[PDB]
Structure of Hydroxyethylphoshphonate Dioxygenase (PhpD):
Amino acid sequence: MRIDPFKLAHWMNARKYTAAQTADLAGLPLDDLRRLLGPAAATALAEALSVEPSQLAADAHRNLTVVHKSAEEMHASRRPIQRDGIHFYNFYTLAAPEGRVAPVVLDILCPSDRLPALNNGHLEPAITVNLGPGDINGRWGEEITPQTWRVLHANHGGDRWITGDSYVEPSYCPHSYSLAGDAPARIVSYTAQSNISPLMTEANNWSTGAFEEALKALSGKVSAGSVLDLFLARRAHTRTSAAEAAGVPPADLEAALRSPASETGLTVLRTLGRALGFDYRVLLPADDQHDGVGKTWTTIEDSRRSRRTFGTYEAASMASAAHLPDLVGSFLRVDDLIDHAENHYVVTEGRLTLEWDGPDGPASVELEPDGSAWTGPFVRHRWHGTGTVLKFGSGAHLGYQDWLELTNTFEPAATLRRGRR
Amino acid sequence: MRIDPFKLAHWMNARKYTAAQTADLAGLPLDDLRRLLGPAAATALAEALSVEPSQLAADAHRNLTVVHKSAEEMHASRRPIQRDGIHFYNFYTLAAPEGRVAPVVLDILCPSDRLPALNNGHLEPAITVNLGPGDINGRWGEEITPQTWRVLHANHGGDRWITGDSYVEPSYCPHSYSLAGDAPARIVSYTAQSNISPLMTEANNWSTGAFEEALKALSGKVSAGSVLDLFLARRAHTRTSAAEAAGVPPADLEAALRSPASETGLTVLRTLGRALGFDYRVLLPADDQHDGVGKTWTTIEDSRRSRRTFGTYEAASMASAAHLPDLVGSFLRVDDLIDHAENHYVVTEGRLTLEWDGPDGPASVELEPDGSAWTGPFVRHRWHGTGTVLKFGSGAHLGYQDWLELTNTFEPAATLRRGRR
């Protein structure tokens, strides 16, 4: 229930109240406010600043660098889920900051002679990999067909650190799993945050008339021209005025919208961008979508083929997708690490040691199979010992969306520094 | 203090608790939960879901379409600000949803014979335009030089609806204004939300070691290669493994990083993107930054030159910037409107009528000079009468960042529809 000095300075600035005016309005001591900027109070500040208490509240957890969970504790979290009249899955949770979404390990208990009843799907996309040792069935449709029923294999060969096939569970499409045969099997399902969730959360609160107008604008093929027209209408420009505004021939502007990726088109849309004040990059094409799981599907052979040395590690790729840049999965063989976002790790073999440099100096924890850890963004760490660990990644900060704003910022490091002190 | 059905379904799904399990854990009636999904309770749900009450709280205001404020009320909000020992400005606020940041009108009271003492700057970038009738001085530096002292002119000619020069106040740089002479003058300063604020808010909570690591990564020239290396390290790939992974010659990958905008480079980075699972677009170059206000500066002549017909309106442009796509300003002459984001309007001449189609059917309000209104995203509206109104725009939803994720979504309209019902 603490106060965020950053959120407070922002609101005093917004309402342009001096420190003294803020204290006088809020009805509390000035040394306190000069301290907060550096319970019974928070309510007053909120009132004096015309904002809800949650708009000034600090984060539930500050200075988190690493969080870990032993094999014993992950096993202790086991929880059975009943579906279709039987013990369908066994629920386990991996390391994750308190309150956050934790990666999940699942026992696949639905026999091969019974179609696995589907769940209702979910917004977040997720990387799912078969830990083995048995093969499993993937179901993505009511009707059983090659497009909605496929075997997610377990590695039966020698390079076991590559545990099995993996793919990306598409956002919102129902799915379920069953055993492909007798051999038991476990699955690891890692979800990243939804990058469209913030928009949805807001759109859900708009009037229904506006919501329908938004859907209308998003309906159909969202081409470069359709997005551009919205940008122009946003600026009270027509395609004609915008063209003469950018000094471009209407004939070429039409071509570029037909070829955003051609160098002729990119030069035009960027020239438009500079003239009208917008970022041409979001106008560039992205690989169309498929709606099936055949595009992201990554077999054991794919992963084996992708093997490479990464520092003191040997790495292999899990399923990925160009339209889900913040979601990553990787097979790591062990015998410094620092990503621009969060990492979720789970050991699959050997007694490994994770070390990290945190607030209290160097630290470390020994983790055995099913043991796991979570690293915050930019937290330098490393793994020692001989074994295997799965490397997952997610996080909105800093996601590919932040990287787009960052390339648009003058001296980003300076901006961040100013915000922190 | 209500509950968000969307945030609740998300958390029950995350923790994968059935409706019954949720009710049993939360300790409340099941019909209630089946109702919320469709005070004393919210606390229980939060506890049972291992989340803070704010993580399930609905928006302070739902179904807002339009908010307006009369000339009399905006005049009634006048507030003097003392600086450098004198009455420096007069503070006025324009229409805005309760709790939100309201556009500001300022009387410039610092005489021409006194250097206007600077403020401490602010994170949000802002479009500032001179309402006139007198010219004013702009100060952007301690020392008075051509780069930090320039006259922001007021239109003294006939097309008064174009009120004067405008420019973009760069994020965080101190600034202030004084009169250029005897003639009085008012200014309108419109700020958009900061697109980097979310990242900052989070980075402020990271350990200092991680923060320093982040600054290090952002320091220097943030080129296509420097961002790519982070993407690769994120995926346990080196430039060598990534190349052979995308089936590209190391020699070409180096060229593309030297020419992201050339069609040869874009084809490579997109091929890399498809292979490694990332969005090549954020790798594309954006116009460098300047740090001065000479790039966005828009004179009266510029605006006059940009005049164009827009539906039943005559429009002229205010200052803009390619790196601030969500911030827009426009001069509108009156005698349907629907943007993909929020609008803030302020009348400068005539008694005008704003109509909108809201939750209760068609509505309308008559606004005179200094009167203002705010429209939510996608809210269809129009202006009737003969006069002039300033059109400002901001909002994160849906900003250019959302448009990047939207082009990456399969059936976005469908996704949003599912989230709402």
Notes: Chain A has 14 helices and 19 strands.
